[PDB]
Ligand binder design. Sequence first.
Ligand SMILES: [Zn+2]
Ligand SMILES: [Zn+2]
Lengths: 188, 11
Amino acid sequence: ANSVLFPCKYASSGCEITLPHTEKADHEELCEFRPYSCPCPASCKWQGSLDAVMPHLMHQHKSITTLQGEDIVFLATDINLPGAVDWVMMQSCFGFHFMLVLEKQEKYQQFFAIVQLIGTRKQAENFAYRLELNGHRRRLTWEATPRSIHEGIATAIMNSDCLVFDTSIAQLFAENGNLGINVTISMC
Amino acid sequence: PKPTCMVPPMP
Ligand SMILES: [Zn+2]
Ligand SMILES: [Zn+2]
């Protein structure tokens, strides 16, 4: 009311919304015309549209393999390897692509496993993912809604809003230095 | 008989 209306930062990309100086910041974060960053877990700093995400991964990250199936096994090899490492692969099911990431971070080591949907924030609400570590007379399960690549996983990992475990847990489910994470994607 | 992928650590 009576306040001057400013166009969105991504008005050049197709945003037809004009908001005042205060409300401007809150929308630009949740804006659909905001460029998508590279979903790969700091080496790559690429940005572009959502339609350019799958070709970018096919060309600049050829080493990432894609498995067909809603229920697969993510066998991350050399989990005891010295230093902080990352494991990434893709899951093709329900006509969509999902990024499966296992992040090893230096602890005062800790592990973070999460699933992202290559799609919008609204598209991610229609899915659910399950992560499970299985052993003899042991099972650790994590279930949640997959994050959209638009918002990423940086905030989610920092809030531990994913499957979180340490070196002690990892050795209980590790077979010949490899950890097998059962990944199940479902439509809700 | 779920498909398994041996994922090596990222280079
Ligand atoms: Zn906008
Ligand atoms: Zn990239």
